[PDB]
Amino acid sequence: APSHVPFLLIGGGTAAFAAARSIRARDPGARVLIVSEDPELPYMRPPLSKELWFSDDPNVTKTLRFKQWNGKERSIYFQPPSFYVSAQDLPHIENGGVAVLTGKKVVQLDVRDNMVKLNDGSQITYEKCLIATGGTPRSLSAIDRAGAEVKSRTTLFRKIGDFRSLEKISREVKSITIIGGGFLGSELACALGRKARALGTEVIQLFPEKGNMGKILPEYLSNWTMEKVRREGVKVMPNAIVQSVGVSSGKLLIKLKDGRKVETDHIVAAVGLEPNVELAKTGGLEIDSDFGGFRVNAELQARSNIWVAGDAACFYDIKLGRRRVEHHDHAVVSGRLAGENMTGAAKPYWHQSMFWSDLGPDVGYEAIGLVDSSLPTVGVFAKATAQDNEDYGKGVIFYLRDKVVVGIVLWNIFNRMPIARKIIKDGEQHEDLNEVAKLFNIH
Amino acid sequence: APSHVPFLLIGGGTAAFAAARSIRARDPGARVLIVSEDPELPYMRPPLSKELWFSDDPNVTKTLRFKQWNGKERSIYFQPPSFYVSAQDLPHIENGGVAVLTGKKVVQLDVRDNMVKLNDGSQITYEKCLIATGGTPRSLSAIDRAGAEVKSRTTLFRKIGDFRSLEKISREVKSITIIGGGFLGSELACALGRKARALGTEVIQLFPEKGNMGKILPEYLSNWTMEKVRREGVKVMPNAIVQSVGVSSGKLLIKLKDGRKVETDHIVAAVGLEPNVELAKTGGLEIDSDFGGFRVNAELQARSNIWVAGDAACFYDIKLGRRRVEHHDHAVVSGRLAGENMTGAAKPYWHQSMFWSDLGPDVGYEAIGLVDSSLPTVGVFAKATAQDNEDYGKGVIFYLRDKVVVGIVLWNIFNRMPIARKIIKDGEQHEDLNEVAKLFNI
Ligand SMILES: Cc1cc2nc3c(=O)[nH]c(=O)nc-3n(C[C@H](O)[C@H](O)[C@H](O)COP(=O)(O)OP(=O)(O)OC[C@H]3O[C@@H](n4cnc5c(N)ncnc54)[C@H](O)[C@@H]3O)c2cc1C
Numbered sequence A: 001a002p003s004h005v006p007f008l009l010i011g012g013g014t015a016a017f018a019a020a021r022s023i024r025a026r027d028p029g030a031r032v033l034i035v036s037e038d039p040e041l042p043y044m045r046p047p048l049s050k051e052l053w054f055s056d057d058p059n060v061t062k063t064l065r066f067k068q069w070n071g072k073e074r075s076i077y078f079q080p081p082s083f084y085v086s087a088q089d090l091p092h093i094e095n096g097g098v099a100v101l102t103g104k105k106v107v108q109l110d111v112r113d114n115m116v117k118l119n120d121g122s123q124i125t126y127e128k129c130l131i132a133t134g135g136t137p138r139s140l141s142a143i144d145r146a147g148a149e150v151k152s153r154t155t156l157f158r159k160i161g162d163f164r165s166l167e168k169i170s171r172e173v174k175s176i177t178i179i180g181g182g183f184l185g186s187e188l189a190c191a192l193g194r195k196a197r198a199l200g201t202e203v204i205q206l207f208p209e210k211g212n213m214g215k216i217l218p219e220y221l222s223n224w225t226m227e228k229v230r231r232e233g234v235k236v237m238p239n240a241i242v243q244s245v246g247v248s249s250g251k252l253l254i255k256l257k258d259g260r261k262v263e264t265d266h267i268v269a270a271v272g273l274e275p276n277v278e279l280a281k282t283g284g285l286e287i288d289s290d291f292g293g294f295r296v297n298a299e300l301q302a303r304s305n306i307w308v309a310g311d312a313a314c315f316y317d318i319k320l321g322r323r324r325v326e327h328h329d330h331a332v333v334s335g336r337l338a339g340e341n342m343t344g345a346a347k348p349y350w351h352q353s354m355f356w357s358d359l360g361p362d363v364g365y366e367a368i369g370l371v372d373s374s375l376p377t378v379g380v381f382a383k384a385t386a387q388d389n390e391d392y393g394k395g396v397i398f399y400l401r402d403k404v405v406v407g408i409v410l411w412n413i414f415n416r417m418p419i420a421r422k423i424i425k426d427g428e429q430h431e432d433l434n435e436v437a438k439l440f441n442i443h
Numbered sequence B: 001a002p003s004h005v006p007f008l009l010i011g012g013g014t015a016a017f018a019a020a021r022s023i024r025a026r027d028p029g030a031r032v033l034i035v036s037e038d039p040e041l042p043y044m045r046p047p048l049s050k051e052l053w054f055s056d057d058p059n060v061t062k063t064l065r066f067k068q069w070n071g072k073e074r075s076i077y078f079q080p081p082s083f084y085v086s087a088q089d090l091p092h093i094e095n096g097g098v099a100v101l102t103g104k105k106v107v108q109l110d111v112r113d114n115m116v117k118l119n120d121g122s123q124i125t126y127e128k129c130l131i132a133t134g135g136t137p138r139s140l141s142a143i144d145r146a147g148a149e150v151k152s153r154t155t156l157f158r159k160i161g162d163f164r165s166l167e168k169i170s171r172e173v174k175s176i177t178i179i180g181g182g183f184l185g186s187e188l189a190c191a192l193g194r195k196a197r198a199l200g201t202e203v204i205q206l207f208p209e210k211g212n213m214g215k216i217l218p219e220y221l222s223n224w225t226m227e228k229v230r231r232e233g234v235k236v237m238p239n240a241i242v243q244s245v246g247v248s249s250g251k252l253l254i255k256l257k258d259g260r261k262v263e264t265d266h267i268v269a270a271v272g273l274e275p276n277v278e279l280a281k282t283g284g285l286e287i288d289s290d291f292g293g294f295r296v297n298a299e300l301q302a303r304s305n306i307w308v309a310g311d312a313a314c315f316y317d318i319k320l321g322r323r324r325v326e327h328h329d330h331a332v333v334s335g336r337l338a339g340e341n342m343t344g345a346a347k348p349y350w351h352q353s354m355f356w357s358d359l360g361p362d363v364g365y366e367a368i369g370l371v372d373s374s375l376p377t378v379g380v381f382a383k384a385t386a387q388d389n390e391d392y393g394k395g396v397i398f399y400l401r402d403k404v405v406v407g408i409v410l411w412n413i414f415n416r417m418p419i420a421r422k423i424i425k426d427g428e429q430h431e432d433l434n435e436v437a438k439l440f441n442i
């Protein structure tokens, strides 16, 4: 570890890599260090839930390569190891370069001293710092209250090791349970159902909502998505609240708060993510209370020489207000912006970030802005229509704050993202939405 | 007037003057422009309610001079007019200077181009900017729902013009009624009661709590302060919720919720302060929701080249969380810090700020930290009365968050600020608040 670096990037993930590329682009000859707790080079997580599961290659868990939108095979890793220079070489190599320090954890942050302390005891002084620590999966209360053997048969799905372990388990066990109905739980349910269709094993999804992804989509769309997920070979059990999890004859037993009971062999828990804010206690950094994570301004700035990007950043969007987004594209855009601002720009967060999803062949969408179930929605579909506050195969769902669009879900329509982005950018008063819904040309 | 200014300070008051002084101290040769909507040069407010009333000099309204703790007469203004340079003279002068552009209001703030627009259409481009606007007095629903005649007879007390108007009114009218029982209301009640006792007129105070300063002091000290204010010649009416204000035979009449009716011919309204945050709408600046005002960090910074100081800043205290202090000492300290940080330092707010108050001769106190009656309270007096949330001439009050001292009120003891400041600095847990009050000479 070098004793001083011009640019420090805490956490090795999407945001840190994007920031390193921006810093290198704007300031040629910059010398960037990335301190990562994972023993791996930066990689993208989205393939860990969809693409690596549908790969035809048998030995994919060891290879980690997949086909793209075009179909050209690529790796999850952002860059090959030859791209990164050694940390010791970093302050000596010509025109700089990015170096990655893997297996290291920053445990202390002295803002005034412009210093951090690693887990092994090494101390690194910086000129500019980015905190791009992400989040960690939340555990279940009933699972925690159970014994050690119950926790041994539970899985939290974030990293590559989780993907490999879950793939081997699905190959070797007879039934797996998914708890949670958000993004990760639903995608895992679809992938595991696809894998289990061949042999004929059982996969179960149970959660306390009315349907799949009930915090994002309206009720009717949630029920439609639930039915589509059931069509993939998954037994979905909505409105289920876990009371206790136990052991019976070598199989774990789920006793719900209701009268229903479930007996299976393995549990996958996808019950949310919480940001890593253990570093704020020693850094004297403010933690947001409404959203969680570090609190930063419109330029993602926490202190004089400290920026925060990614999932842990509770930033201030000027158009939409205080936010905290947890998505791949937001991590890329936010890291790019923080890298621009670390070299000397003063740009606020302006370009909006989107996200995408695919819950099987039938369901596939992209969304932008503020998308939430509590906010008023206007669903203009094809062959159907519904507004809140049957053939829902195609359509657009506007989200309105005060007669103004703040988020758009584009349901099974493609190459119509710029229209939605321009609608969000203009931010006009919209008392009528069928006049604008024709721009996407749903029919 | 100049097209480009290195250092712009929006709003000229206590914080702006302190910031200009810090800028000049750290960076000799600087060129500071102060844009103020007032027609006057910066002055200090605290003597506008206490010192200028007790002066024996007849024409203090014009001189605006008063005596102090040392006893040396000084002006209400921070500096004499010769100290400042002209606005057109600022760009080209050896070692620069400070120029105040009085009577001009900043109406638009464009952070993208680093340019502001004044109310006369002139544009000024800045390199660093400070927003040191203050607050404006809050009005009353009963007053605002009334007619123009009732509005013309009520007073909101912030500036020098209000002080002159109220002094003339006190010399003229027979009865004065004061709404509000916080700091300003109690101080004006004491001053006008002294003047009335000197003359022989009537002064009345009404507020919706059970005692004076019930949002700062505990209940028993609130009752004690209410009694002591009554001894000053002021008829105090606690628990008076105002319903409507009207006129009857050329005299104002107040009808309260409980049924009491009070007649008078002038009203002084002092019911709080609302921060000036109209610049945030056009500047893309974030306004705090819990406390109000511009939301800044521990370094009092809002954007890349923008700092906020004074009563309008909702800053983050590392040791005490989110705060918004509205006091003269805090304005001085925060303006000083923001002026230092505009020149290159990155110092967070660490030095605490205190506040004092004198309510007659018997009651005089100082306070520091988080002082609020909502927090659990332990008071050490001649008889040790601990509050759960006799003679109380002298004592100390500790305010607790959870077994930790966050604010201390010093009751009729002086030259003991450093002890309380040191106690608050190292906020370690205490088994009981006693044996700590021994540090103060009770
Ligand atoms: C299985 C899966 C599938 C996903 N699919 C999608 C998708 O299809 N679309 C989408 O938009 N989003 C998707 N996401 C979300 C997206 O991947 C995340 O939002 C994104 O990875 C967040 O990037 P980040 O850099 O903020 O955090 P992360 O990617 O979590 O990186 C955080 C890194 O920082 C390290 N770290 C933390 N604390 C410290 C410390 N103190 N010291 C050192 N290192 C530290 C961690 O170990 C980790 O390596 C998916 C996520 C998962 C898990």
Ligand SMILES: Cc1cc2nc3c(=O)[nH]c(=O)nc-3n(C[C@H](O)[C@H](O)[C@H](O)COP(=O)(O)OP(=O)(O)OC[C@H]3O[C@@H](n4cnc5c(N)ncnc54)[C@H](O)[C@@H]3O)c2cc1C
Binding pocket: B010, B011, B012, B013, B014, B015, B016, B035, B036, B037, B038, B044, B045, B046, B047, B048, B049, B104, B105, B106, B107, B132, B133, B134, B135, B157, B158, B159, B184, B276, B309, B310, B311, B312, B326, B327, B328, B329, B331, B354, B355, B356, B357
């Ligand atoms: C009568 C009175 C007595 C007080 N007594 C005490 C006391 O005994 N002890 C104590 O601790 N505190 C006391 N205070 C409180 C203390 O005086 C204030 O908290 C302090 O003055 C706040 O300073 P500031 O610089 O933030 O605001 P201010 O002093 O209000 O300065 C704001 C200035 O900015 C100007 N401005 C506003 N908007 C704009 C704009 N858009 N463009 C240009 N200029 C603008 C305003 O006109 C004003 O000149 C008293 C206050 C009053 C009114």
Ligand SMILES: NC(=O)c1ccc[n+]([C@@H]2O[C@H](COP(=O)([O-])OP(=O)(O)OC[C@H]3O[C@@H](n4cnc5c(N)ncnc54)[C@H](O)[C@@H]3O)[C@@H](O)[C@H]2O)c1
Binding pocket: A049, A140, A141, A179, A180, A181, A182, A183, A184, A185, A187, A207, A208, A209, A213, A214, A215, A242, A270, A271, A272, A273, A326, A327, A355, A356, A357, A358
């Ligand atoms: N396609 C995508 O964009 C995508 C895909 C995968 C993951 N992700 C990200 O991964 C992260 C983690 O995913 P996640 O799905 O775990 O997050 P999430 O926030 O979607 O998970 C919350 C889900 O768990 C349920 N839940 C909450 N508490 C519960 C409890 N006590 N018992 C049972 N159910 C409970 C909620 O009602 C909801 O269904 C998120 O940041 C998410 O955005 C995104």
Ligand SMILES: NC(=O)c1ccc[n+]([C@@H]2O[C@H](COP(=O)([O-])OP(=O)(O)OC[C@H]3O[C@@H](n4cnc5c(N)ncnc54)[C@H](O)[C@@H]3O)[C@@H](O)[C@H]2O)c1
Binding pocket: B049, B140, B179, B180, B181, B182, B183, B184, B185, B187, B207, B208, B209, B213, B215, B242, B270, B271, B272, B273, B326, B327, B355, B356, B357, B358
């Ligand atoms: N000694 C000092 O520190 C001092 C002295 C004077 C002024 N100041 C400052 O001057 C500013 C103005 O003082 P203030 O006394 O107006 O503010 P304040 O916030 O102290 O006033 C609160 C008082 O107004 C009362 N009130 C609120 N709403 C009311 C309503 N609808 N009807 C009746 N009463 C109502 C409250 O009950 C309380 O008695 C404050 O910022 C204060 O800090 C400080």
